[PDB]
């Protein structure tokens, strides 16, 4: 468990990047592939630039993408997480579609039904795992988190924060717009061999200090994002002007 603190948002990404880059490379030469869950968000997207800018330091054949949440908006929509990806990544690089596991839109296979499209993504996942694992072990979950320190579509008191069985969930009533997600629940973030959370900016700066301070991840969410090997908080120094 880290904290790393940087001048800027600019400058976070950028080391995110690098060690991205590095880990994706370390996750193949032990393993064959990499498993990295993709996040939305400002930083999150933007880390996705960055690895296209190095896009030949990576041997895309080997590395495989999920998502922590999505929105369940239309397919085509700027809102999607999956859209945002394929604009700052996917389009222009030679990963294999097939390596590529996006959740569902609104105006896919399921309509009102979003707890079938839940677990149509669990199933994926089930079927991405290890023999006998409910879900594959992340080499690294990205993440950002909002002011409240929701992380994913994880929000607090909602019940798919209280969620303990299930590697993904409806939500439907998120009191962010737009009102319906699919998400990762925290035992499977907690899967992750590392978790990576961007945080920037003076509006999450206490919310990171009271997840920092040990909250009950029911009340501050990002709390419950603990990686198996280590959990890392890349921080700009507004984000982090609320530690002790």
Same mark, same amino acid.
């Given at each position: 468990?880290?904290?790393?603190?940087f001048?800027?948002? /600019?400058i976070?990404? #950028? $080391?995110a990047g690098?060690?991205?880059?590095? !880990?994706?490379? =370390? &996750?193949?030469?032990?393993?064959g592939q990499?498993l990295?869950?993709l996040?939305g968000?400002?930083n999150?997207?933007?880390?996705l630039?960055?690895?296209?800018?190095q896009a030949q330091?990576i041997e895309?054949?080997?590395?495989?993408?999920?998502?922590?949440?999505?929105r369940?908006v239309?397919e085509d929509?700027?809102?999607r997480?999956?859209?945002?990806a394929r604009?700052?990544?996917?389009?222009?690089?030679?990963?294999p579609?097939?390596?590529?596991?996006p959740?569902?839109?609104?105006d896919?296979?399921?309509?009102? /039904?979003?707890?079938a #499209? $839940?677990?149509?993504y669990?199933?994926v996942? !089930?079927?991405? =795992? &290890?023999?006998?694992?409910?879900?594959?072990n992340f080499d690294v979950?990205?993440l950002?988190?909002?002011?409240?320190?929701?992380?994913?579509s994880?929000?607090?008191?909602?019940?798919?924060?209280?969620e303990?069985?299930?590697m993904?969930?409806?939500?439907?009533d998120?009191?962010?717009p737009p009102?319906?997600?699919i998400?990762?629940?925290?035992?499977?973030?907690?899967?992750?061999?590392?978790?990576?959370?961007?945080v920037?900016g003076?509006?999450?700066?206490?919310a990171?200090?009271?997840?920092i301070g040990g909250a /009950?991840?029911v009340?501050?969410?990002a709390?419950?994002?603990?990686?198996r090997?280590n959990?890392?908080?890349?921080?700009?120094?507004?984000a982090?002007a609320?530690?002790?």
């Open positions: 468990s880290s904290i790393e603190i001048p800027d948002s /600019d976070l990404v #950028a $080391a690098k060690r991205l880059v590095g !880990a994706i490379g =370390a &996750a193949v030469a032990a393993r990499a990295i869950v996040t968000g400002g999150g997207i933007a880390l630039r960055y690895l296209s800018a330091q895309w054949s080997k590395v495989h993408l999920f998502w922590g949440d999505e369940y239309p929509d700027d809102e997480n999956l859209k945002q604009r700052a990544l996917l389009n222009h690089v030679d990963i579609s097939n390596q590529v596991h959740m569902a839109a609104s896919g296979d399921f309509g009102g /039904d979003l707890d #499209a $839940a677990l149509a669990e199933q996942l !089930a079927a991405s =795992a &290890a023999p006998g694992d409910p879900a594959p979950h990205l950002g988190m909002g002011p409240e320190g929701h992380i994913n994880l929000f607090p008191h909602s019940p798919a924060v209280l303990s069985t299930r993904v969930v409806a939500v439907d998120s009191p962010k009102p319906r997600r998400t990762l629940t925290l035992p499977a973030i907690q899967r992750s061999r590392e978790v990576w959370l961007l920037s003076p509006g999450k700066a206490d990171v200090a009271a997840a /009950d991840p009340s501050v969410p709390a419950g994002a603990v990686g090997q959990t890392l908080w890349l921080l700009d120094r507004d982090a609320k530690l002790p």
